[PDB]
Amino acid sequence: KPAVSVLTMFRYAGWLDRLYMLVGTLAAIIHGVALPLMMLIFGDMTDSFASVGQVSKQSTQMSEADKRAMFAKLEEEMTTYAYYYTGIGAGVLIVAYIQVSFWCLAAGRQIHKIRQKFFHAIMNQEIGWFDVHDVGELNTRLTDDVSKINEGIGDKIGMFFQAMATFFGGFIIGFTRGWKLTLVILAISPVLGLSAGIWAKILSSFTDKELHAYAKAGAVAEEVLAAIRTVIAFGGQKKELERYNNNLEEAKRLGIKKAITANISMGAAFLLIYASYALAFWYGTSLVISKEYSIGQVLTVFFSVLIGAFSVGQASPNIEAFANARGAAYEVFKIIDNKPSIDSFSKSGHKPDNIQGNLEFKNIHFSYPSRKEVQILKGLNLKVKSGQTVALVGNSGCGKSTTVQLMQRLYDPLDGMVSIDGQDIRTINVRYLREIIGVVSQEPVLFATTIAENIRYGREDVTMDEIEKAVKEANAYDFIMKLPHQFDTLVGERGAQLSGGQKQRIAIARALVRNPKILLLDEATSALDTESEAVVQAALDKAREGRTTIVIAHRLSTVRNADVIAGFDGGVIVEQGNHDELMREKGIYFKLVMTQTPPASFWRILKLNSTEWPYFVVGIFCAIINGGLQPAFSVIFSKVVGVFTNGGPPETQRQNSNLFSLLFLILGIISFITFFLQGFTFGKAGEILTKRLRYMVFKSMLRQDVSWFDDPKNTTGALTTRLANDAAQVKGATGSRLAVIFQNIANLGTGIIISLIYGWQLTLLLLAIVPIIAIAGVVEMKMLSGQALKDKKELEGSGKIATEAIENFRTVVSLTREQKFETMYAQSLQIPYRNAMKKAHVFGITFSFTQAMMYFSYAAAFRFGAYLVTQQLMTFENVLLVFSAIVAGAMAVGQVSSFAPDYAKATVSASHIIRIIEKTPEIDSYSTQGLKPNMLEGNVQFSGVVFNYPTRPSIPVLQGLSLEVKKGQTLALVGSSGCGKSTVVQLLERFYDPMAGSVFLDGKEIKQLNVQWLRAQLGIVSQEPILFDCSIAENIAYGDNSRVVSYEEIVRAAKEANIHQFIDSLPDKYNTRVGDKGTQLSGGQKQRIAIARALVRQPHILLLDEATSALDTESEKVVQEALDKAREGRTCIVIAHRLSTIQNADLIVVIQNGKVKEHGTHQQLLAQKGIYFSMVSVQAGA
Ligand SMILES: Brc1ccc(Oc2c(Br)cc(Br)cc2Br)c(Br)c1
């Protein structure tokens, strides 16, 4: 919404840049004007053949007499028109180079200045300006927004003026050559603008319906693939597939309806557009029979107007490119034009010599940019005598850290003054002030260069001697010399990450080359290891003694030797003095001392598509007919002008043009019929395989075991995405792109034959010219993409050192050295600058060539079409036919290169979709094999079980686990932590087979048992029960599948679960909908329902996995009261964390490092004193 003045945007264009754009836009207008003139000559060539075509047939008496005056007229006329033609091609060759080169030249020159001025402006802002902004968005604003500006001031403006030239020039030649046909052509324009306006309303409203249609199926997939362990445990994998298959069945019905209506729309609009033209052209014929327009003049206006009409559309993108570049330049120039109060680039203010360093802070009130919300310094008073070292102490707020901020004048104070020596800080030059102030901050930062360079960031003029004495005076010399490569080592976020106490020591050495008169040490010892803290602290004490120093830390070790100590309370300075006096005061300081003491040939995807042997042959045969039918419109147009030029006697003409215009309309409707058929067949053929694919994928997805769903690669979102994308993509490859790719090869094929058998060698010539201008058009785009990737790689190096400069900014400005990053950025940009100059010459050459190759190609079409061809007993009516046939057949092959990525993007989406079906699990619930024992009573034997999780085979959970539990008794499961308590329940559900050892139930190893039948006897209840969106009766009936559960049966379980108070209280009762779609209830009710579905199954085994995890107050007392009643009649395993509710258990087992450690009844483990006694004691006392 915000934008920029047009002149301010070009403020960096001066002298030559203003000229380049002028010559550029000039040649751009010359370029545009060239085309409607080229079509104007196409009319004069018609009248030459028409004056001879009428007189050649007017004879029927003399033959050799027509070999003289006709051929002479043709000789003088065709050589004239061909000479003019060769002239236009040389013109476009020059102006197209001038057009693109000059504009790209002005673009590159300015963006170089923009980028330099922009980065210079970024470094000029004061710190308060950064505290209110996002540096990441700013740096992306530096590289992205400058690109948008370049796109708008580049050759796009030349294209814009070239287009308006065609538009004006087309309608000038239109109006002058004929004021009637133009008004007629404009009269049908609203119909064309109205038919394509039905497209913007149908697409935008139906693209939502499909994104709404699958959103109903993808919601099933989401709540399924999120609750996968629950459907796996309850075996609803046939139902959850059925529901998805039922929503897939609706999405395909809405997809064929959209296929019916959209193909009805596309054909009807195409028929309206082609009927609109043919009326304007048949109207053209109605004015030649009246001797008011020449048959060649009808063409000149009909082409020039339609050319200029579409030139409007071909200019609209360049308008948006310029406008976006304006609005992109707003926030950029706003930074360049913003002027600071602090500067630091300013050459102003005093530079005191012999600074003795007597600092004082006077009545300083301050607040950081969070402004009226907080005021961190309510008044202040502090002097620090020269040579002395004052220490600032404080409980919190870190108003301590604020004085160092003000002392460098990173901010100016709200009220009061900071005075270095006797002068106010604001009277001294900002840069010189920061140069007489050395800073060592808590988190030290080193830039990605050599140590000597990072030390060189203290002072640019320095020799390895001073670097050596600096690091040796910080006792940082001993440890870097042992490091390889000496001073030439590397540091940064990338490479050679060092110890913190060593980085701080380089920072002290960096600040030491500064030889500052003032020193500020902010928590430089804080947050550092204890051993190296002394190594650095010795350098700090050796860094002072020559300077006046303010130091802030929470280490009361460094503070004793300070000549003065200062305490803060609420931004108010409270206590000050030597260490002993503060202890005698027994105030804030004394208080704190005591406290601290693969693209491949995939045919099988088409073999699945072979489910429909028809519907394809219908469309292909229909598309090839439509292919063969398109050039027949060019044949008609050829003979509507052909018989009109080859007329002779004029009486028969008027009756013939009516017959032709009639047949064309019969051919257009027969094209509409074959277009609605080739679009509906492919549409319905691609919609059913979308169901088959999403069905077979979602089926195979439910086949995999919990091992697969645990993968970080496969999350519920990444699976639904993989589920939607791959299925839609393969529909496109077998969809419209194929029907079109066959219609077009049929369109060229049926066009090439007609042209070949008519004009001999005429076609053989055009087939030499067209593939070259097409390849030359392709190679230009390859060079275009090559130049694009290269410059992206080069400015990336510049923006990389821009990222470093602005992300670590508050440090660089503390060290000054901002001019350094400017020059580095300038040198980095100097390569893309000289690159951008060559770009203009390249872009201009390629564009001018592809334009010249099209115009010279046109000259070859007629100079050969006349002369050698028409000096033969030939037919001009054929030369026009081969032009339209071949050129349109070629431009229809131009659609092959556009649908090429639709094939690759689909094969890649097919690559994953064929493997996701074929991948097989280790535990497949689908296998019907397995024993299915007949004996009811349930035991469980864990024997020597070692288990590791396939995602994390590092820390083991189960090592040699061994349990046993008889029928009808409760096995309590206590654990120090982790899923060692929970993995038991997962292995019994056989979510995994154990690595070593085995687990039996009735004595049969579950590994040889039937996987589904096994889980069918298990009453799993977990921490967070997930309930799908449906009737609670259904969430309950989910406990028993392969059979519909009775109402009184799901009542009995709801009675059992003590949830009946809700189920009757509701208005809908058992038919109420749950799942945060229809209704919402608290967790206690959700769990009771999960208990109900658990025992709707009537299992012989309950599995209560911390069932009271998330619960509170009376809700726990009522849920535990339901679980306690659900067991005692069944085999049970309870890992619940309530050991008070575990007291009445038949056997309590303590898990330790995967081994069983203690086990026995409650009082038995209470008699022993150890882990279980400690577990019961710790949470009964607390
Ligand atoms: Br009659 C007649 C035939 C083709 C005409 O232009 C074309 C041409 Br040329 C090709 C195709 Br496809 C469709 C149309 Br409409 C005109 Br205008 C009038």
Pocket flag, ligand 1, residue 278 (CB < 6 Å): yes
For ligand 1, whether the C-beta of 948 sits within 6 Å is no
Secondary structure, 3-state, 364-388: EEECCCCHHHCCCECCCEEEECCCC
Distance 176 CA to ligand 1 centre (A): 24
Q: Torsions phi, psi of 1051, nearest 5?
A: -70, -45
Q: Which residue, among 622, 896, 628, has the nearest Cα to 747 in the 3D structure?
A: 628
Cβ of 270 below 6 Å from ligand 1:
no
Report the alpha-carbon distance of residue 157 to residue 640 in Å, rounded. Answer: 40
With CA atoms as reference, report the closest residue to 963 among 909, 910, 1018, 1000: 1000
Q: From which experimental method does this structure derive?
A: X-ray
Determine if ligand 1 sits within 6 Å of the CB of residue 165.
no
Alpha-carbon gap, residue 887 to 897, rounded angstroms: 16
**Pocket perturbation via mutation, ligand 1, pick of 39, 295, 307, 634 by most ligand atoms within 8 A of CB:** 634
Return all residues near 748 (Cβ < 8 A) that are at least 6 apart. Answer: 889, 890, 892, 893
Sequence-distant (≥ 6) Cβ neighbours of residue 1065 within 8 angstroms = none
* Helices and strands (H and E) in the chain: how many: 40, 21
Q: How far is ligand 1, taken at its centre, from the CA of residue 307, in Å?
A: 15
Buried b (16+ CB within 10 A) or exposed e, 358-393: bbebbebebbbeeeeeeebbeebebebeeebbbbbb
- Residue 521 phi/psi, 5° resolution? -120, 105
For atom 11 of ligand 1, the residue with the nearest CA is 633
The count of other CB atoms within 10 Å of the CB of residue 437 is: 27
DSSP E strands in 1034-1088: the ranges are 1073-1074
**Radius of gyration for the alpha carbons in the chain, expressed in angstroms and rounded:** 43
Tokens standing for residue 1053 = 């379980």
Instruction: Using the mean position of ligand 1's atoms as its centre, give its distance from the Cα of residue 198 in Å.
Output: 23
**Token pair belonging to 960:** 């040699």
What is the maximum span of the chain, computed from C-alpha positions, in angstroms? 138
CA 481 to chain centre: 46
Describe the strand order of the beta sheet including 548-552 as a list of residue ranges: 437-440, 518-522, 548-552, 389-394, 564-569, 572-577
Ligand 1 mutation pick, 192, 633, 664, max ligand atoms within 8 A of CB: 633
**Quick check: helix, strand or coil at residue 836?**
helix
Q: Which two tokens stand for residue 806?
A: 């602005």
Q: Are 839 and 157 in contact, with CB atoms under 8 Å apart?
A: no
**Distance from residue 878's CA to the centre of ligand 1 (Å):** 16
From 188, 272, 277, 891, the mutation candidate for ligand 1 (largest count of ligand atoms within 8 A of CB) is 277
As a whole number of Å, the end-to-end CA separation of the chain is 61
d(CA 774, ligand 1 centre) in Å: 24
Choose among 1096, 1107, 980: nearest CA to 1035.
Answer: 1096
Query: How far apart, in whole angstroms, are the C-alpha atoms of residue 530 and residue 522?
Result: 17
Backbone angles phi, psi at 650, to 5 degrees: -85, -5
CA distance 447 to 460: 14
Look up residue 610 and give its amino acid. Answer: S
Structural domains in the chain plus CATH codes? 1-177+296-348+760-873 (1.20.1560.10), 437-556 (3.40.50.300), 1027-1098 (3.40.50.300)
185 lines ligand 1 (CB under 6 A): no
Task: List, in order, residues 6 or more apart from 978 with CB less than 8 Å away.
Answer: 957
Q: Which residues carry a binding-site annotation for ATP?
A: 394-401, 975-982
| Alpha-carbon gap, residue 464 to 514, rounded angstroms | 15
User: E-strand spans in 554-668?
Assistant: 564-569, 572-577
**Rounded distance, CA 191 to CA 195, Å?**
6
Beta strands at 572-577 and 1101-1104: parallel, antiparallel or unpaired: unpaired
CA of 70 to the centre of ligand 1 (A): 30
HEC profile for 167-201? HHHHHHHHHHHCHHHHHHHHHHHHHHHHHHHHHHH
For residue 664, which atom of ligand 1 is closest to its CA? 1
Q: How far is the CA of 298 from the centre of ligand 1 (A)?
A: 14
Nearest atom in ligand 1 to 884's CA: 9
Q: How far apart are CA 546 and CA 190, in angstroms?
A: 86
Given a contact cutoff of 8 angstroms between Cβ atoms, the answer to whether 638 and 880 are in contact is yes
**Three-state secondary-structure class, residue 429:** coil
Residues 357 and 549 sit within 8 Å (Cβ to Cβ): no
Query: What residues does 415 pair with on adjacent strands?
Result: 365
Q: Is 634 in the pocket of ligand 1 (CB under 6 A)?
A: yes
Contacts for 273 with CB less than 8 Å, ≥ 6 apart: 192, 195
User: Atom 15, ligand 1: which residue's CA is nearest?
Assistant: 274
CB-ligand 1 contact for 661 (6 Å cutoff): yes
The rounded distance, in Å, linking the Cα atoms of 240 and 224 is 7
Collapsing DSSP states into helix, strand and coil, what is residue 1152? strand
| CA 806 to ligand 1 center in whole angstroms | 61
The answer to whether the CB of 1028 is under 6 A from ligand 1 is no
Q: Is the CB of 644 under 6 A from ligand 1?
A: no
Q: How far, in Å, CA of 539 to CA of 560, rounded?
A: 16
Q: Identify the burial level of 674 via C-beta atoms within 10 angstroms of its C-beta, where 0-12 means exposed, 13-18 middle and 19 or more buried.
A: buried
Whole-number Å distance, alpha carbon 857 to ligand 1 midpoint, is 23
Beta-carbon-side half-sphere exposure of residue 54 (alpha carbons within 13 Å): 15
Nearest CA to ligand 1 atom 1: 661
Q: Is the minimum distance from the CB of 1058 to ligand 1 under 6 angstroms?
A: no
Q: What distance in Å separates the CA atoms of residue 510 and residue 504, rounded to the nearest whole number? A: 9
637 lines ligand 1 (CB under 6 A): yes
Binding residues: 394-401, 975-982
Q: Is there an atom of ligand 1 within 6 Å of 277 CB?
A: yes
Q: If you measure from the C-alpha of residue 1074 to the centroid of ligand 1, how many angstroms do you get, rounded to a whole number?
A: 62
Q: Are 176 and 308 in contact (CB under 8 A)?
A: no
Q: How remote is the CA of residue 772 from the centroid of ligand 1, in Å?
A: 26
Helix H segments across 704-761?
706-709, 716-733, 736-758
Question: What is the SS3 assignment for 326-339?
Answer: HHHHHHHHHHHHCC
Q: How far apart are CA 547 and CA 561, in angstroms?
A: 15
Dihedral sign of CA atoms 698, 700, 705, 709 in order = negative
Does residue 754 sit in helix, strand or coil?
helix
Neighbouring-strand partners of residue 975: 1151
| Pick from 6, 34, 9: nearest CA to 855 | 34
Atom index in ligand 1 nearest the CA of residue 280 equals 17
CA dist 965 and 881 (Å) reads 92
